[PDB]
Amino acid sequence: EVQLVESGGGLVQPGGSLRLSCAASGFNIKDTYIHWVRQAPGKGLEWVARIYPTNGYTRYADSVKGRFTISADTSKNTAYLQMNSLRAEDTAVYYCSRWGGDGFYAMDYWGQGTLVTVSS
């Protein structure tokens, strides 16, 4: 039942805020790295952040650095993306995924996508 389920997107105006959810099932968040990857309406895939839920390690893309925070609740087996100070440019379908395991750093499982629209 290895699956990622996302939640939390909607319409939100410029300079607003949103918390998306990626709840793991079938495996455990602490073990793997969790990625959020977005995809703007016309465009391709763009990596935004990453977290290792055992040690708490995060890395972020420049676009998002300082505006967004990725976090993990290991008891709940859920990761989060807190997106504050939302620019119109962040409108995309957000996807969390994982790295399979050791020596397997391809994103083998992804969630369905949650859409964040940002306009007036």
């Binding site: 391709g44 990596w47 996807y95 750093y105 391809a106 994103m107 083998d108 996508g113």
Partner: protein, 109 residues
């Protein structure tokens, strides 16, 4: 934050055709390249990892190869369900970065 340059933007072909997508890494990335497919409104799906290994369950008509900085995906005999968009990715460093995509469409006429 190595860029992956993907050729072509799109192509048209038919059921049964052999097709080849290419990605060029701007730097040496070793073998740390994966290939994803994505159909519209759906999430990506891993096809190939470590530049040439088939992920479980993916159709044996798919193969990856590498030569230097160049990574190639061939689909040897296109089936209906293969008309989708394909992305390469490198994950050798942070950020993992993606090719801009190749929509593989059917020639209608």
């Amino acid at each position: 934050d190595i860029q992956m340059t993907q050729s072509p933007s799109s192509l048209s072909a038919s059921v049964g055709d052999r097709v080849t997508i290419t990605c060029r890494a701007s730097q040496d990335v070793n073998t740390a390249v994966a290939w994803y497919q994505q159909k519209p409104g759906k999430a990506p799906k891993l096809l190939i990892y470590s530049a040439s290994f088939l992920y479980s369950g993916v159709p044996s008509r798919f193969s990856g190869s590498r030569s230097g900085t160049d990574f190639t995906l061939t689909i040897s005999s296109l089936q209906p369900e293969d008309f989708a968009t394909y992305y390469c990715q490198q994950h050798y460093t942070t950020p993992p970065t993606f090719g801009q995509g190749t929509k593989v469409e059917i020639k209608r006429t």
